[PDB]
Amino acid sequence: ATEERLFHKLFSHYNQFIRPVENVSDPVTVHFEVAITQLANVDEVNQIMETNLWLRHIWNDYKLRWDPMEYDGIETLRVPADKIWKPDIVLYNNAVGDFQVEGKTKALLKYNGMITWTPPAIFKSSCPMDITFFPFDHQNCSLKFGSWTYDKAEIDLLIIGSKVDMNDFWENSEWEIIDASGYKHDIKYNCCEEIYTDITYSFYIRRLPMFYTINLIIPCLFISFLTVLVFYLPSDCGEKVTLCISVLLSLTVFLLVITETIPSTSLVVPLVGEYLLFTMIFVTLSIVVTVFVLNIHYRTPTTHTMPRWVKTVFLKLLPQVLLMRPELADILNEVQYIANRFRSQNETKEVEDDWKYVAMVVDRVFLWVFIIVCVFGTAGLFL
Amino acid sequence: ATEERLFHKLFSHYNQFIRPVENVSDPVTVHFEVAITQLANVDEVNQIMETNLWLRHIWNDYKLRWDPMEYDGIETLRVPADKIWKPDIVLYNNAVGDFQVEGKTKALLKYNGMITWTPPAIFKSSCPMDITFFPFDHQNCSLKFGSWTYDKAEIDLLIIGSKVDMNDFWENSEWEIIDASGYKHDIKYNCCEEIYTDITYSFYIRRLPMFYTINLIIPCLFISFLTVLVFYLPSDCGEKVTLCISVLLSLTVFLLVITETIPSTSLVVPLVGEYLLFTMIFVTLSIVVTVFVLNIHYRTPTTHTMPRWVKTVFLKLLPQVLLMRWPPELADILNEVQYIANRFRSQNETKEVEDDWKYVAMVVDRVFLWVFIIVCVFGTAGLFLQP
Amino acid sequence: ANAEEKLMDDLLNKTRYNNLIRPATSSSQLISIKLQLSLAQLISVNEREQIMTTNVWLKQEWTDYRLTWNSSRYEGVNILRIPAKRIWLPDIVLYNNADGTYEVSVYTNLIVRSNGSVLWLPPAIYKSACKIEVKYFPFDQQNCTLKFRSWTYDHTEIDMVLMTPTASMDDFTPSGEWDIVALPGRRTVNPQDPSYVDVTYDFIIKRKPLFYTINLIIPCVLTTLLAILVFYLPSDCGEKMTLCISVLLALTFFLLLISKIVPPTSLDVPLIGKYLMFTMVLVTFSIVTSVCVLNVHHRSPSTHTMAPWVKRCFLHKLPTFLFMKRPDLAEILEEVSYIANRFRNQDEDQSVVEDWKYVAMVVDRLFLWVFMFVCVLGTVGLF
Amino acid sequence: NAEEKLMDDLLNKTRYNNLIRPATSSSQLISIKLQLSLAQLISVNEREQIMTTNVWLKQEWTDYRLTWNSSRYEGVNILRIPAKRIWLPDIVLYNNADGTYEVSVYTNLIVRSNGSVLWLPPAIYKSACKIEVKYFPFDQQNCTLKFRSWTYDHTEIDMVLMTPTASMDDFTPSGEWDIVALPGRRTVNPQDPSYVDVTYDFIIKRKPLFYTINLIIPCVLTTLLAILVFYLPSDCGEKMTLCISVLLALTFFLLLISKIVPPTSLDVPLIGKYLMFTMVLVTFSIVTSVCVLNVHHRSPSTHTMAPWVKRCFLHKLPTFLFMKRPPDLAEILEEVSYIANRFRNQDEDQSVVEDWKYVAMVVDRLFLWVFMFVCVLGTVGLFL
Amino acid sequence: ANAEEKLMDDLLNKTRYNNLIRPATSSSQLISIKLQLSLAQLISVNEREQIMTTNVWLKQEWTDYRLTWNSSRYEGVNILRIPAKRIWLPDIVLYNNADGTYEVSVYTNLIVRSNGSVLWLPPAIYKSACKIEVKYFPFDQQNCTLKFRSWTYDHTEIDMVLMTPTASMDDFTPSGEWDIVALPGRRTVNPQDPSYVDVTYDFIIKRKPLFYTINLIIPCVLTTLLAILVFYLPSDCGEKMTLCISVLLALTFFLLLISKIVPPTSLDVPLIGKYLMFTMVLVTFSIVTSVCVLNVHHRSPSTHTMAPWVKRCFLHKLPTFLFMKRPDLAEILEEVSYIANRFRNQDEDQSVVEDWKYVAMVVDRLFLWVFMFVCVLGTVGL
Numbered sequence A: 001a002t003e004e005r006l007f008h009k010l011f012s013h014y015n016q017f018i019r020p021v022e023n024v025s026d027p028v029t030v031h032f033e034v035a036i037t038q039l040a041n042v043d044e045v046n047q048i049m050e051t052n053l054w055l056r057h058i059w060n061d062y063k064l065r066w067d068p069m070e071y072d073g074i075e076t077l078r079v080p081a082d083k084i085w086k087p088d089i090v091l092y093n094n095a096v097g098d099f100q101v102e103g104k105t106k107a108l109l110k111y112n113g114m115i116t117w118t119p120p121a122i123f124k125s126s127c128p129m130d131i132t133f134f135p136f137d138h139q140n141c142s143l144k145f146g147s148w149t150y151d152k153a154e155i156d157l158l159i160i161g162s163k164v165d166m167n168d169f170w171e172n173s174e175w176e177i178i179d180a181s182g183y184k185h186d187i188k189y190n191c192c193e194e195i196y197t198d199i200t201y202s203f204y205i206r207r208l209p210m211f212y213t214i215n216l217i218i219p220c221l222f223i224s225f226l227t228v229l230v231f232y233l234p235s236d237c238g239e240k241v242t243l244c245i246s247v248l249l250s251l252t253v254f255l256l257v258i259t260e261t262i263p264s265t266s267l268v269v270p271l272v273g274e275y276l277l278f279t280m281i282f283v284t285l286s287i288v289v290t291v292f293v294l295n296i297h298y299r300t301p302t303t304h305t306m307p308r309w310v311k312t313v314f315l316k317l318l319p320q321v322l323l324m325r326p327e328l329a330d331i332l333n334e335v336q337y338i339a340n341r342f343r344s345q346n347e348t349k350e351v352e353d354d355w356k357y358v359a360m361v362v363d364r365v366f367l368w369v370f371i372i373v374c375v376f377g378t379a380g381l382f383l
Numbered sequence B: 001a002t003e004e005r006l007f008h009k010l011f012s013h014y015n016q017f018i019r020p021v022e023n024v025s026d027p028v029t030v031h032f033e034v035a036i037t038q039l040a041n042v043d044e045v046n047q048i049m050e051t052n053l054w055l056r057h058i059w060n061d062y063k064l065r066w067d068p069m070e071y072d073g074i075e076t077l078r079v080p081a082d083k084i085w086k087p088d089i090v091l092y093n094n095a096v097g098d099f100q101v102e103g104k105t106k107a108l109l110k111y112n113g114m115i116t117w118t119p120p121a122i123f124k125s126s127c128p129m130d131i132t133f134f135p136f137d138h139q140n141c142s143l144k145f146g147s148w149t150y151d152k153a154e155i156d157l158l159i160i161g162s163k164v165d166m167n168d169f170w171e172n173s174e175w176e177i178i179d180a181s182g183y184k185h186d187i188k189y190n191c192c193e194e195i196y197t198d199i200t201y202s203f204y205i206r207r208l209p210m211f212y213t214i215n216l217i218i219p220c221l222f223i224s225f226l227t228v229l230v231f232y233l234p235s236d237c238g239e240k241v242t243l244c245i246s247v248l249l250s251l252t253v254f255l256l257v258i259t260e261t262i263p264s265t266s267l268v269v270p271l272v273g274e275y276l277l278f279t280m281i282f283v284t285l286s287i288v289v290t291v292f293v294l295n296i297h298y299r300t301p302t303t304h305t306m307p308r309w310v311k312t313v314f315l316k317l318l319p320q321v322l323l324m325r326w327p328p329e330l331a332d333i334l335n336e337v338q339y340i341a342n343r344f345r346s347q348n349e350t351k352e353v354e355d356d357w358k359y360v361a362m363v364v365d366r367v368f369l370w371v372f373i374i375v376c377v378f379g380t381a382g383l384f385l386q387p
Numbered sequence C: 001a002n003a004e005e006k007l008m009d010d011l012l013n014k015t016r017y018n019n020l021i022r023p024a025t026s027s028s029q030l031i032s033i034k035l036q037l038s039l040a041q042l043i044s045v046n047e048r049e050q051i052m053t054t055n056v057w058l059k060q061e062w063t064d065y066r067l068t069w070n071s072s073r074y075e076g077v078n079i080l081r082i083p084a085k086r087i088w089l090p091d092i093v094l095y096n097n098a099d100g101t102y103e104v105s106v107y108t109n110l111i112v113r114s115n116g117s118v119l120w121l122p123p124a125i126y127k128s129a130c131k132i133e134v135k136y137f138p139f140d141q142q143n144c145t146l147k148f149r150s151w152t153y154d155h156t157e158i159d160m161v162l163m164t165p166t167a168s169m170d171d172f173t174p175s176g177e178w179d180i181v182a183l184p185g186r187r188t189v190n191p192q193d194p195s196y197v198d199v200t201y202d203f204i205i206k207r208k209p210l211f212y213t214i215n216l217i218i219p220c221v222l223t224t225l226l227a228i229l230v231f232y233l234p235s236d237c238g239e240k241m242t243l244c245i246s247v248l249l250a251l252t253f254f255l256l257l258i259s260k261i262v263p264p265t266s267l268d269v270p271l272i273g274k275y276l277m278f279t280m281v282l283v284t285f286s287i288v289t290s291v292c293v294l295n296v297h298h299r300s301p302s303t304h305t306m307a308p309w310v311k312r313c314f315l316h317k318l319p320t321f322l323f324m325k326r327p328d329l330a331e332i333l334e335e336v337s338y339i340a341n342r343f344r345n346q347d348e349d350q351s352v353v354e355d356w357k358y359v360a361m362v363v364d365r366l367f368l369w370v371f372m373f374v375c376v377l378g379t380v381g382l383f
Numbered sequence D: 001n002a003e004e005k006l007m008d009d010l011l012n013k014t015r016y017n018n019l020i021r022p023a024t025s026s027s028q029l030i031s032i033k034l035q036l037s038l039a040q041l042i043s044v045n046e047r048e049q050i051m052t053t054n055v056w057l058k059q060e061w062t063d064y065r066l067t068w069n070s071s072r073y074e075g076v077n078i079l080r081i082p083a084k085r086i087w088l089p090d091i092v093l094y095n096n097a098d099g100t101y102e103v104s105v106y107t108n109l110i111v112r113s114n115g116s117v118l119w120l121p122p123a124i125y126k127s128a129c130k131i132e133v134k135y136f137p138f139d140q141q142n143c144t145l146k147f148r149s150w151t152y153d154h155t156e157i158d159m160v161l162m163t164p165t166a167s168m169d170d171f172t173p174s175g176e177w178d179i180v181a182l183p184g185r186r187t188v189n190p191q192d193p194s195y196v197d198v199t200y201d202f203i204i205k206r207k208p209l210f211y212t213i214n215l216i217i218p219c220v221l222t223t224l225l226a227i228l229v230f231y232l233p234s235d236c237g238e239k240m241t242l243c244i245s246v247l248l249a250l251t252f253f254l255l256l257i258s259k260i261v262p263p264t265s266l267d268v269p270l271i272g273k274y275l276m277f278t279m280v281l282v283t284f285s286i287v288t289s290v291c292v293l294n295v296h297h298r299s300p301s302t303h304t305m306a307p308w309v310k311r312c313f314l315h316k317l318p319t320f321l322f323m324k325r326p327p328d329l330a331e332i333l334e335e336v337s338y339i340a341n342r343f344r345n346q347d348e349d350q351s352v353v354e355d356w357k358y359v360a361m362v363v364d365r366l367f368l369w370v371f372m373f374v375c376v377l378g379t380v381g382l383f384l
Numbered sequence E: 001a002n003a004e005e006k007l008m009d010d011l012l013n014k015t016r017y018n019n020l021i022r023p024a025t026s027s028s029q030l031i032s033i034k035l036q037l038s039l040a041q042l043i044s045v046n047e048r049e050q051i052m053t054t055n056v057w058l059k060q061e062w063t064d065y066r067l068t069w070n071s072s073r074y075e076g077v078n079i080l081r082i083p084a085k086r087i088w089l090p091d092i093v094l095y096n097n098a099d100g101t102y103e104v105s106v107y108t109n110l111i112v113r114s115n116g117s118v119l120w121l122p123p124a125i126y127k128s129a130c131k132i133e134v135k136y137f138p139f140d141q142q143n144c145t146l147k148f149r150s151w152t153y154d155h156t157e158i159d160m161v162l163m164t165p166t167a168s169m170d171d172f173t174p175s176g177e178w179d180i181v182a183l184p185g186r187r188t189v190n191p192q193d194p195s196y197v198d199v200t201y202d203f204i205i206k207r208k209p210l211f212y213t214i215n216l217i218i219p220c221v222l223t224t225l226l227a228i229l230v231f232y233l234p235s236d237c238g239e240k241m242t243l244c245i246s247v248l249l250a251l252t253f254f255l256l257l258i259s260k261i262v263p264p265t266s267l268d269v270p271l272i273g274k275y276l277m278f279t280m281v282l283v284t285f286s287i288v289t290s291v292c293v294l295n296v297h298h299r300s301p302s303t304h305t306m307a308p309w310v311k312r313c314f315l316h317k318l319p320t321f322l323f324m325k326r327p328d329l330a331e332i333l334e335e336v337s338y339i340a341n342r343f344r345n346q347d348e349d350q351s352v353v354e355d356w357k358y359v360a361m362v363v364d365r366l367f368l369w370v371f372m373f374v375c376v377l378g379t380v381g382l
């Protein structure tokens, strides 16, 4: 038919290595446009972004043209991309893999010579991340495009519009896109001379705080609440060590999980890490204090002797501040001895009871300190 | 261009589907030799060894030859490997992927027809693992090479030297290679009729124990020796089961880890997987004694009665051999006092029985402590005798 | 020129051998394709992924007619090796591959005789998909199959037959984990649709239990045997709750181990997985009854009172069932009488206290038989 | 060689170009009939919201160049030209999540003397889907597959559906999902006159067997175990172990559930909301257990009992809680009097200690009912 | 027909550019290739697998002679861009690839000048293998190499040479975990072998410890400091065994974390790892001593007897060394005397029990100083 003859005549003599300009000193205008389909994965520990895109190269040729008044008015044609000249546009900041994109999809010509190539692509780019406010953060990730061989005197890129097309976008459950603007730059390198043009598209995203405000923040708050209780347990219960050590182990496990969840960047200190370190230090301090009150509780006049300054401070001034507030001779000799034994026992018991009250005052002093500092530290540091 | 003319003349009429032999019914000799570059890893869960090699083929040809004088003194060319006949040597005992080696490196023609081909290759072979002594073990894995279709009367395989060429080896960190010998055999398979030749190269790697001793064996000894401590704790302390439970849980975790680090082969029993089973068995038997000795400590004269067979055994006979030898108005006032005295006497009489029960419990604990020490000292010299 | 060179040219160029046309002469002619599969190495069997890896050889052998010559004109040559991708091949591929590998392995040489009887023996490693049954986990027996079917042709064009009804074990390296019982092979043809012929080889493999019956069965039994000791504790050691919960945690560990080698199931579960659940339920009931016994033990006449029902039904009747047998002188007299009366009242109160200690022991002993009988009865039901 | 000659004529002599639409007129659409056949269903992984399946896509169009006069060459009626020699409509999936934008393997084509062409290539797809995890055990899903041509538009392609259902005859039964329906719809938007596609709405209902005995029963068992602490005595010394163990078990259960199902900010599973309630109640139980333990250990030599405490916890509260409240002669006289007075003081102190213990017991009983009623009140919106 | 068309025809047409012949006017001429590496982005360094990923730009610039023309007949064009698939290449590839692929993909254009110069700068992402030293894990500086050698050729044919002694980094996007120190390069040729020429670049990178110094070390220090509190708890509390076992598990948690970052070690154990084993051994010794102390505390005259030497060495010598210090009337008389004697006996055995308790308390304090002094000497060593 006429289509076969047109195809044969058009592609009988074609040099696919020559620039499609007719004058050697003239740039070949190339339009560029990016359309996104989905946002598949945003890796944090590895700092890698993966997306599926629809690149759109449209330019103009000079020798693949014809008039639709001879061949029955045919105004369009489709030819595989392997037999035509196509500009080389590559991703500068590729993280893994190669740089070749496509070439299976056939280009669309016209009677003017305009090609409308539109190949699919999948890219894995690199993106540094800031983990200052980890649960509630905004990330800025960008893609860099440009020609790898031709400079501004052969191929000059032109941007279509200013935003990535979002007509066919599958919404991500975790991340939400805010802005997707793009801009053109003219950069000059130090390895080689001449100026080179590039087009960069920047994606602005914001996380949705539901997964990490439920599985991480809530149990952390529960554990940080549980630590103050050890100063209300009596010393006779014998279960303070269990509680405090359980709290410590829970915090250690949380530390490990958080370490293996967020990336290891050494620029700024994340808020969660600071709060967890502060809470762990305060929990470690509480265990040290607990041993001392137990040691004070189990003290007797046989072993330890009470000083004066202890009696001067405790039981006297500190509790007021914390608003705590014949045969007859032998019978006498037998009955008496018994009474003297009872008197000595009473004195020993009184002295023992004095030591028990000191352990109660010390625990009350450290109850107010922890509640005063912990409530202000959590409110202030965590904003 | 002299080289272009030589290249055109050599490959003007040539096909790679025909053997390079000149006269029919004659074998073409092929010299084979491998060389190792880097041993990536030696998997034990799947029994797979991955290795990087450099195969070398040196065979002959008759139609690829020329007179140097007729040209500008050229005695060496470089032709693509996809244009000449090449023998098909494959790895018989593959484990994954394909069998054919990766060949793209250009050959090296000589003026008398001596082709040389040295293509890189990555192989993942499969060898059985011996776990009789999981640490300090000596593995023995082999690689088999042979032609798939050409028999012994056609390809006539040969070998160079007797050892794998180790000159560019990048040394590993966990294994040490001590022998890389190779031999040639002839086999007659059942499906075939003619004899077929092979060349087998066998490695003799040896493990370097630094990771599986300080992190596997040494921490286990503390747990193994911490089981006997229970029998020295007093019954009145109130922490006689926390130690036993902790030891049992630690042994369970250790068993889980060693199970999920070892192949599931069931031909031989490892000398650590049975030692830890024995330790777990005797740890379980230790908890039973503790419960049966915590119960004899709290018996009272008003709930249990001590039979004579216990008094004459656990109180007088056994403690000797354990070096723990046994260590109007006046009338009413009199009426009242006598009552107090009798009450005190009854209290003393009950306290004596309670103390006897406590001593019996102590004797039982000491006997089991001695038995467990004696057995556990023997244990190690046996299940872990020759590791 | 060489004899093989001349033979190959005059066979593959003069006649223009095209490897697209079936070698059949009649239009409705079937070409028999004899098969024989020989096992070489049983690599592995996967439980969670339900895939089996093997090393097998095929022996497809049809009888072409165009590839014939005389053993005198072309020297004395009678066997001529030819590359595989130069002769028509009935594309027989594995039809139950784990993934989309509906292809073949590398192409080795063909063996063509003067009779035309082609012989193809390609090496290949197959990863097929087979169903796994894990009822008797350490002593199970699996039946994994291999289905071979045509890729391009169908019946009335090919007539795949079986050369021998047994897969030979030539060049077999014995395994150390899985045994082998039999390797039957059957030919299946659909009576209704006369366009479906296939050959399936069934693998019957039996496990060799020595690595699991030492590392999972014995420890599980040992841990399960610790669930009874809770009822022999003296109830006065303050350690009746550190044992049952610990046993529960150990059984949780052992159940975790099992739930890894077992595929996600919806039709059958291993008998060990049914034993562990029974043991865990028994342990939970043990925790409940231990709490109740501990509550019963700590009682006194100043907080509770003993009804006649419990007094006469837990101290006389039930213990027998379990074989469990049980004027200055005026003032002086007044004071001594007061002391004696106080002693008498204290003794009476202590004696009343000791009654609440016996009922706890009786209740604990009663639940010893209930939990021992149920566990023994439950074990019989499983096996 | 008659068949070989017939193959030659229709591919070389007639010059069957592979890049020309088989259309005679300027507006003759190529009518494509599509029929999807199901083979098996593999994975419905809800962690990344993908589904894997294996299908065969059956397509059938018509050509006018692929016709030969039967009974003229040899009498042949069917050919087996390979796929990459005849114009193809390029029907692909437009929602795959891996970049797989084509079929798996190009099989052979079946062409008859009538000109009709039948193509059945096997394809493996990993489509994208939305998972509604709010009744996680008893959940019904709806995932769609979109088929479109990435080369031609409604001006030259007229995809139509053969039957309003998917073919399921070789469907190997699934092990953990059940099919309920498989409709097929063709969508044409009046605003855009160049948009045509077909969609096969998969509908799958879960079978709650694995996740109803191994996931829910242990959870309710632990929740029922969480109440036992209010019944232990305060002298046993094992009151702070049970509560902590229960809390750590519940936390582990919550973590495992969040690992199985990723609760996002669109819907929380009804099993993921009950564990929060249980953990909050367990924490309050820990706090009140600490309070009751502190109340129990209170000697009269360190604390003083206010009259309001007596009148509120020994006369009023136990009624509603259904509790019950159960010469040398002068010197000898002096010594015995001292002993008697000491004994009387000891008795008074012991009585005060018993009063404190009973007050702690009464406080313990009250919270047994409060936690039992709040459990019932809570478990009507968080579970119904 | 433009001018580039005639240029490319006369270059890769009837003159028959063979594409597989080494450019050499004579039989002994050596082609000299000048190399220069430009680092662009240090992606990651993996200690567990010992693989480093980089984004580099390697420039190769040899000199051909068949690609030359007079820039007067063909208009005024003197620079062309020919694809890298129809021109001879030296085939220089990385010789220490981690996966083991000595192959590259060629799709980028060349730049052929008028006088024969050829410039090739192909993009590439490399995954090399390098030795990782972990003696000081938080504060370590590594030394990983890149080796470039020819594949299809050897010496006596090529003359691989260096253009700049260093590797210019004038495209770097700074990392967040590693700091670049210097990037020198050297050319090694073995005189004992006339067929060996090499060019290699080595990277010296110093870590930036802020994340690990906060998520480790400090918690380990706190947990280690917690290990000495057991020797102060009273024996009557009955939680000594609870305290000891919990500390060991917490130290076990940290050891697992550290061992999952460093690779399987052979002879260079990290300094933060040897500390933890020492602490664990000390804690086990503490457990044993605590068990012994608990046994000593619970003693009574009815079951144990105090030897005369115990009351002389453990009571009056050691405590001074550790700075510590401490008609019917006959029947009435008989009964009251019996009561008095019973009270005296009770007092005597109670005093003996108190002596046993004090002996245990003295024993406990002795190991507090031994633990303190043996701990500091162990830290001084490593």
Ligand SMILES: *[C@@H]1O[C@H](CO)[C@@H](O[C@@H]2O[C@H](CO)[C@@H](O[C@@H]3O[C@H](CO)[C@@H](O)[C@H](O)[C@@H]3O)[C@H](O)[C@H]2NC(C)=O)[C@H](O)[C@H]1NC(C)=O
Pocket: B140, B141, B142, B179, B181, B183, B184, B185, B202, B203, B204
């Ligand atoms: C296992 O290690 C041993 C040595 O480390 C090797 O196995 C045996 O090695 C000897 C060589 O010392 C072989 O003997 C050789 O046999 C040829 C057969 O023609 C004969 O000419 C000589 O007697 C020669 O010494 C022996 O066949 C071989 N046996 C086996 C079973 O391997 C080898 O390195 C390793 N083999 C395997 C399978 O891992």
Ligand SMILES: *[C@@H]1O[C@H](CO)[C@@H](O[C@@H]2O[C@H](CO)[C@@H](O[C@@H]3O[C@H](CO)[C@@H](O)[C@H](O)[C@@H]3O)[C@H](O)[C@H]2NC(C)=O)[C@H](O)[C@H]1NC(C)=O
Pocket: B191, B192, B193, C061, C063, C113, C115, C117, C119
């Ligand atoms: C064409 O001529 C050959 C010349 O022998 C005829 O012999 C058959 O050739 C087949 C090869 O396809 C051989 O099969 C052999 O079978 C034995 C017994 O199973 C086995 O041990 C061998 O390894 C081989 O597989 C064999 O030489 C012979 N077949 C038999 C059953 O004897 C062949 O039959 C002729 N073909 C026709 C179509 O006439």
Ligand SMILES: *[C@@H]1O[C@H](CO)[C@@H](O[C@@H]2O[C@H](CO)[C@@H](O[C@@H]3O[C@H](CO)[C@@H](O)[C@H](O)[C@@H]3O)[C@H](O)[C@H]2NC(C)=O)[C@H](O)[C@H]1NC(C)=O
Pocket: D112, D113, D114, D115, D116
């Ligand atoms: C052009 O000729 C073909 C055959 O050369 C005809 O198409 C169909 O050919 C067979 C001949 O019996 C029939 O196919 C039918 O398919 C349905 C699918 O569900 C099946 O249920 C039937 O049992 C039968 O196998 C069918 O009779 C015939 N189609 C029609 C519409 O008659 C037909 O003559 C021509 N094809 C077209 C598309 O025009």
Ligand SMILES: CN1CCC[C@H]1c1cccnc1
Pocket: B147, B148, B149, B189, B191, B192, B196, C057, C111, C120, C121
């Ligand atoms: C020599 N090979 C070893 C395995 C099969 C055998 C063989 C024989 C003939 C044709 N191909 C392969």
